[PDB]
Every structure is written in C-alpha cells, then in structure tokens.
C-alpha cells in the first residue's frame, strides 16, 4: 500500500474529479457533504485486490464526522469510482461501542461484492470501529 492524497486533494484534480461526478448520475436525495466530499479527509492508500489496483479514500460530514463517514474506492485507472455512505443514529449511547449494530449503509456506483468488502474493511480500519 501507498499513501495518496486525502479525497479533498484527488477531488481537486481534473481526472478523479470528473469520474468523482460520474459515479452520481441517475442517483437520487444524494446530500450535498456526499456529492462534496471535502470534509475532514484521512490520507488515502493505492492498494491491490486480487491484481486489480484501487484507491481507497475517505471523508467525514464537517462538525458530524464519526457518525456520517465516506469510503471511497477510484480505480487505479480513473476509469470508475464505488462508494460507501455509513449513517449511525445519535442513540442510544452504546452506538459509539459497536457502531456497526447501529450503521445504515448506501453504496454508491453499483461495486461488486468484493468492492464492497474492500469499503467495509476501510471502514473497519478505525480502530474503534466494532
């Protein structure tokens, strides 16, 4: 793995922000933070999946950050884009000990199942994500 930009900086150049923009036609009651994604952003990883490359990014809901979380796979080639939107409730108080009971989830540009297992394990790289 790699460190790469955070999802604000690859958002700012021309090739991650057009396939960024891509990744949302035909989606409906997209919130605005989602479409943006240029919140509070830990660096990003160039990593492999089975011999395919991807970039995985993150972003966070400015001033609601632990509670309306972004992943972000691009392809290494720019071609495509997948997405994960977790939602967790505000209560009870045990959301914060094991979110993952708790979480809504919406997937972005229809990933296949193993996409979607690479976003979960972005997710799960908090290490206070249970």
Known sequence: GEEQPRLFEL???PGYKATWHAMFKGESDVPKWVSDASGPSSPSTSLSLEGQPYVL???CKPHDCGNNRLLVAFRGDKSAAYGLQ????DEPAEVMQTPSKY???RWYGEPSRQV????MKQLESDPNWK
């Open 103 to 105: 979480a809504t989830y």
């Open 116 to 119: 979607r297992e690479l976003l």
């Open 11 to 13: 958002l700012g150049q």
């Open 57 to 59: 990014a993150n972003s």
């Open 86 to 89: 977790v939602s967790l409730p």
